[model samples]
Target chain A: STMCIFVCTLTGRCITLEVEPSDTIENVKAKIQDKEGIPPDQQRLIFAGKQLEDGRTLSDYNIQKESTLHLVLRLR
Target chain B: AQGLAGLRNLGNTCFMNSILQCLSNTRELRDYCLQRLYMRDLHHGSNAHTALVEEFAKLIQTIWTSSPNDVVSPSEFKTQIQRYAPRFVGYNQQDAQEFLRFLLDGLHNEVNRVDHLPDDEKGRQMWRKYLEREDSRIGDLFVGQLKSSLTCTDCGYCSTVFDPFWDLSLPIAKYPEVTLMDCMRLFTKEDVLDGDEKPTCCRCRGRKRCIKKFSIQRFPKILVLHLKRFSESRIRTSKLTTFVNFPLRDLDLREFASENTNHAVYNLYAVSNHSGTTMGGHYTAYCRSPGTGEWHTFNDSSVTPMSSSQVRTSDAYLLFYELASPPSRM
Candidate 1:
């Protein structure tokens, strides 16, 4: 159980959110959507220079405490 | 990142669904399919390219933007494709090759018809012109030119011919441990087709054996390689269970090329696998996401992230390769 920071690539705003070990990337996206007002589907979360898959857990990607993710909105 | 939603299987339409998913994974080809100019005309009927072009654009769009867990129905697109191809009318686990050829031929006829500019150099110039346009171009992505060389064994008479192919049908290796490279080598190797298979050379030799070989003449942006697995026997077709080692990156074809050149090296991005028996089988695909460079398994409509090592297996039936990266200009 740890908190991670997501920095918006557009405005460089940081949102620190707590996450569980088993929390999937999709779960994190939902948490961000509620707080940041960005749709969960539109958020493109990048951690360790790799786009995190929705079905994959944050820990499956070796994301640790205070890990940073660059968030970008996927355009149509 | 969100991958494409799974497709709904309509009866025994897994054959069409698998190929469609595979094509959806190809970023360039999908983009081209989406960008194609669609004009509805009654001449080609419901299965025509224009109808297909319209449905495909929507299908691909839905694949990318739809709900992650939601399964998308490609019914309209599937119906159009099958309408164009009467062979798939009553689908019973059809061959992926047949559907691929049918789709490409239909697309080529529809798009190539507009290219009546100037008949110089066999209208390759006109085709190139269409290829550079805003419309979709799947034929340009998969089609490649090969030099066919027939050499007479007795008098050394050689006749050279050139042909374009939608996919390369490489002969499967006989050895227990066969690499994709080995299959490629066998494709370019010269073999004597003698006895009843002897060719009557018009020039140097009368009735004698001739050696046949093919070299890669023109390379496509997306190269499709088909490993001839189903060996058709006198009685029935038998599937070869030989394990073939392929590359996820840096597949150099210089060894088997007619002329060893740099144009042969390609990076593998997708693989189509066949599971079951020779008579009927299920088709699935493993593709790398163009946006994330991540590998994922596409089984019917469901998509799952897969490791790079899992890309190679005995079930490999079709391999898709693209020219080395920095091909961003495409």
Candidate 2:
């Protein structure tokens, strides 16, 4: 099933995305990149204090509806 | 094998020896000094009076190029450091964390590449200005930015300040059963500044009750964690023998950082341990071999192999963690 989640940028900008529990972190980053124009490699998503790895699924991190994932840009 | 050498105690210089061993095991710093990469900055920069980098680089070479069982004396380096900072002139027992701070500051000043000064800036801009003036291999490898925000309760106005830190001092007074993360939480937790301690708020126009909070703005390549185990007051001084468990690998600091990046992960490399009390104590270093990844202890003029489990001890006063991988700058 799909649910809505919030991605908060470092600049206090927040975006809502509809994602499935089975979707991998890489897939979420792809959606964020499409919307925020941040490249997948440069996106680091953090939820509940732990970093979201590319290979892990939303369910792996137990990301639920309305959960806020903090987006920090990778250092160049 | 190259990083397993011990250091001789020149009087009460175990504190210096312990911190030096930890720095010697820092792979990037060791390699930079061993390859003589600091020579270009030393010759071109005008701040040649410190001479700490040259002596420190020589000491690094001596430690790494020597036999595994060999004991090296840091007499010349000690003399040079003492010359730069006269407080270390005597054979008194010194605090290892204090020595690390002073030594890094001295080394940074010697090889600092900034030629001109910039105008005063605020927040992250101020941090950029600091980098423009304090740029060096030492700064690049060890410096991290801290964001301290103070919010006035009356006006809801938040004033933020950004400052660079060489190491994190974590307080462990609140809990008996503690992890390093617990101490980190206490360090970053919001605290109220009421009554006489409050500062004037920009919006409020006077001293007001404020809530202050701290967070990491940037992560350093080498993260030094100093456990606040020693408490000193006018009346008396004492040491806390608390066993704070810390992770050896994959320490994720995403929670405490305001800007958590993929490279915020760290692996434990070295630890400077202080045993005994505030009056009389001994210092030693437990460092991991950069080449073999084996753990070893470096006591004054003695070296011994150690099991990985033995690294977690109540005697741990300082911890040295490096980024799991090197961070690339733009």
Candidate 3:
């Protein structure tokens, strides 16, 4: 099973979430919501400057183990 | 007369008999007195007073190490001594006054005579002469060493010891047309990065063209300023002194005062190599309003398009600032 770590770009604060490679993107969103207080509807996941679409599963996107994901909250 | 009266006041044969009983009974107080009084040459030097001071310092260290959290209460310690001694014997007002005098004189002598020296005899004599010239130079040297050892959290580089009178290892980048005296002017008005170039270290590269901002940290209760200015004409030389206001509650004030202000006023300065192309110089000054305290410069406007990642919280009681300039040769 692969583990994912979420890092805040501005403050350098991070948290790690463990999940099986079979978990879907929605599951990762739920974990992020639990830790970051941001809901899945408003939160956007950006990887290498591109947003990951909803309903995409981890293995479907070929997410690897120990991969880093950046979480950015939209600012006005 | 008082001593005799005290002995007589010990109430009848009962008390005297009690004292006799104690003389044959409790041995702890006697043992303690014997140990302290006969404990090897606690006073070893030619000067009894100097030996006492050194012994006191050692005693303080001993007690501190034994109970690191122990609170020192002079009055309580005196009471304890009184309890262990005969009435009017151990410590009285006269004894306290004399002890204080001895301590004050010994402290003054030690401050005036303390020296830093190498193990060699020649080095001892050299250090003696140095102390005679500047009694506080030893303290300044120690402070300089401490400052050098401090690591800057932002850039992870140690700062150099600052000297305000004249440029040391750091090169002074003067404005193209500004003279030494003009550059020495206490304060100047300029917008953003328009001021004359200031002195900085060799590692400082992209300073002048960088933006600058100012910020304040915690305010101090008392702010002091010491200023010295010298001037020379054909036939005479003269000096003047004055102080300026410091900004205490300004939203712009940073924890660490700007290096430029510290250099200009307080004789404290520092340089950093964090910014890829620029370096910083900072200074400190007193502020009376918002609340009495010292102010530091962020100098953000001096640098172009300030990076959000570059901002840092200033530590308590310090006004930190940054100076960015293009690296140039001396």
> By DockQ, who's the top model here?
2
Q: Tell me the lDDT of model 3 at B189.
A: 14
Residue A61: error of model 1 in Å?
Answer: 53
What does candidate 2's lDDT look like per residue over A1-76, in tens digits?
Answer: 6655556543333455667899999999998877667677656565533456777999996665545565653110
Candidate 1 docking classification: incorrect
Model 1 interface RMSD, one decimal: 27.0
**What DockQ was computed for model 2?**
0.01
> By the lDDT metric, which is better: model 1 or model 3?
1
Clashes of each: 5, 0, 57
**Candidate 1 chain A, run of 10 with poorest lDDT:** A4-13
Deviation in Å, model 3, residue B226 alpha carbon:
44
TM-score of chain A of each: 0.85, 0.92, 0.75
Error of 3 at B14 (Å): 99
**Tens-digit per-residue lDDT, B163-279, candidate 1:** 445676666667577888887777667655566445556675355677766567677788887676744334244677678888888888766565556666799888888877875
Q: Per-residue CA lDDT of candidate 2, range B1-330, in tens? A: 366678899998999999999999999889889989888777453535646888999999989888868889899999999987775898988878767866887787787786032212354685677666678987888888776666789999766656566777666744466898887877777767665445556576666777767778888899998776743333244577779988899888888887655668899999999998765789999999899999999998999999999999988989999987646687
**Interface RMSD in Å per candidate, to 1 decimal?**
27.0, 18.0, 29.0
TM-score of model 3 vs. true structure: 0.20
Clashes of 3: 57
